[PDB]
């Protein structure tokens, strides 16, 4: 499914991996949530390990480089669309 | 040289590459690939985190060590 997640501005308690410049997720250019701290802000916002981040405040990151995705997430609540499951 | 770098948690974003399970840096090491545009520099090899050795860690082992609920990093550069 595809879910809308509201994520505070960045700490968030998450790591992301991946990108079009190339882990156990997918299998594959996507950017994925690779770990969330259990009571961190990312977890409480409803993000999940394995989530594929599709967009960030309208920026399409489905084919983005790893650093493109991150920059998007760190621009100074974020609206994320993720694919999961 | 090898430096101990203290970073207050609230400094924003850290990117890393490498690991033992495996860029232009270095090695089997874990290396800082980006820092949000203080103290740490791109290309720094991360040797320890909060006194815990990561010199030989896997990439995911490094990540889990960086992802901590102040953060202390021991790094080698050059």
């Amino acid at each position: 499914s595809v879910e809308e997640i509201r994520l505070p501005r960045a700490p968030l308690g998450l790591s992301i991996v991946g990108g079009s410049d190339h882990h156990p997720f997918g299998v594959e250019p996507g950017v994925f949530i690779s770990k969330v701290l259990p009571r961190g802000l990312a977890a409480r916002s409803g993000l999940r390990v394995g989530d594929r981040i599709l967009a960030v405040n309208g920026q399409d990151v489905r084919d983005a480089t790893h650093q493109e995705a991150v920059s998007a997430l760190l621009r100074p609540e974020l609206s994320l669309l993720v694919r999961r499951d | 040289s090898v430096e101990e770098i203290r970073l207050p948690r609230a400094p924003l974003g850290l990117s890393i590459v490498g690991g033992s399970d495996h860029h232009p840096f270095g090695e089997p090491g874990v290396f800082i690939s980006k820092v949000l545009p203080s103290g740490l520099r791109v290309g720094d090899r991360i040797l320890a985190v909060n006194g815990q050795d990561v010199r030989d860690a896997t990439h995911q082992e490094a990540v889990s060590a960086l992802l901590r609920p102040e953060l202390s990093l021991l790094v080698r550069r050059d």
Partner: peptide, 6 residues
């Protein structure tokens, strides 16, 4: 293989 911690 690149990760980011935020």
């Amino acid at each position: 293989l690149e990760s980011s911690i935020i």
